[PDB]
Structure 1
Amino acid sequence: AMGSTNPPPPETSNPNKPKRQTNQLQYLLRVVLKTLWKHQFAWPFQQPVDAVKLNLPDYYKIIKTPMDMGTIKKRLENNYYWNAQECIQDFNTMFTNCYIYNKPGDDIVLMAEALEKLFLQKINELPT
């Protein structure tokens, strides 16, 4: 797109941020992320949106809090989180961003919805 760049991606480590490894965060990585990561429709969400490559120069004009499963995975692996709610919120940021940027019925929106369906099935069974 010519001098077009992507923002730097979200941090996946912060040494001055309080961290914990809860039973619920282990399940988020072990169940909820391994499940969605393997899914047939995961691929658009496994890394930050490459707006340069995909030729989407308004992406990061509309989406100011980007999130993707690549980011979430690295955060879960690097024990970035204090609790499972922080993580679940990143998942919801990723789905909402997609629904914001795109329009109902778009292939991408069907992919996100399939993944979100699956997300929620798995999160129902989050151990206390």
Structure 2
Amino acid sequence: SMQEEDTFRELRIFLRNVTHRLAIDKRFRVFTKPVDPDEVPDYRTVIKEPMDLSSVISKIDLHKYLTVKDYLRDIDLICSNALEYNPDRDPGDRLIRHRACALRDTAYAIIKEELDEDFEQLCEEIQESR
């Protein structure tokens, strides 16, 4: 229905605003663009499904996310990719792990304060109906 398309358009407006608030933070600059295979040729041999905040914006605009749950699985993949690629005790690895955990905690905290639980339940019911 038109009302169902209006529900998904509101979900996209909400997700683009959360994603842009993450992408302007200093702590998260390293997560804003894909890894340049020239600067890091090893990356795509270790990390099988790369993800970044620019790609998240592209996926919102392509109508890939019908629920906040499917958006948060891509925020989780940004975080887990950083933890797996940078696992050592050295300070550069520890700094990107701390930033990756802060990106995931920040996204979940914005969604906990600003997403109505009944709005997400409606999206999940339209998705399960299709």
Contact 2:51 2:77 (C-alpha < 8 Å) held by counterparts: yes
Q: Measure, in 2, the Cα distance between the counterparts of 1:51 and 1:117.
A: 28
Secondary structure of 1:41's partner? helix
TM-score by length of 1: 0.71
CA drift at 1:22: 5.5
1:127 is matched with 116
Q: Which string of whole-angstrom CA distances, capped at 9 and with x for unpartnered residues, describes residues 11-48 of structure 1?
A: xxxxxxxxx72544432222x21221111122111111
Match of 2:25 among 39, 64, 69: 39
CA contact (8 A) 1:25 1:83 kept: no
Letter matched to residue 76 of structure 1? I
Rg (Cα) greater in structure:
2
**Does residue 21 of structure 2 align to residue 51 of structure 1?**
no
Contact 2:12 2:60 in 1 (8 A): yes
Equivalent residue in structure 2 for 1:115, among 88, 97, 103: 103
Q: After superposition, what is the alpha-carbon deviation per residue over 1:67-109, rounded to whole angstroms, capped at 9, x for unaligned? A: 1111001222343322222111111111100001102652221
Aligned residues: 106
Matches of 2:66 and 2:107, distance apart in 1: 20
Amino acid at match of 2:51: M
TM-score normalized with structure 2 length: 0.70
Deviates most, 90-99 or 106-115: 106-115
**1:25–1:84 contact (8 Å) kept in structure 2:** no
Say whether the 8 Å CA contact 2:11–2:66 is kept in structure 1.
no
Q: How high is the sequence identity, in percent, across the aligned residues? A: 26
- Structure (1 or 2) with the greater helix fraction: 2
* Separation (CA, whole Å) in 2 of partners of 1:49 and 1:27: 26
2:87 maps to which of 92, 103, 115: 103
Deviation at 1:60, TM superposition (A): 1.0
Which stretches in structure 2 are left out of the alignment for 5+ residues?
1-6, 118-130
Runs of at least 4 residues of structure 1 off by over 6 A? Answer: none
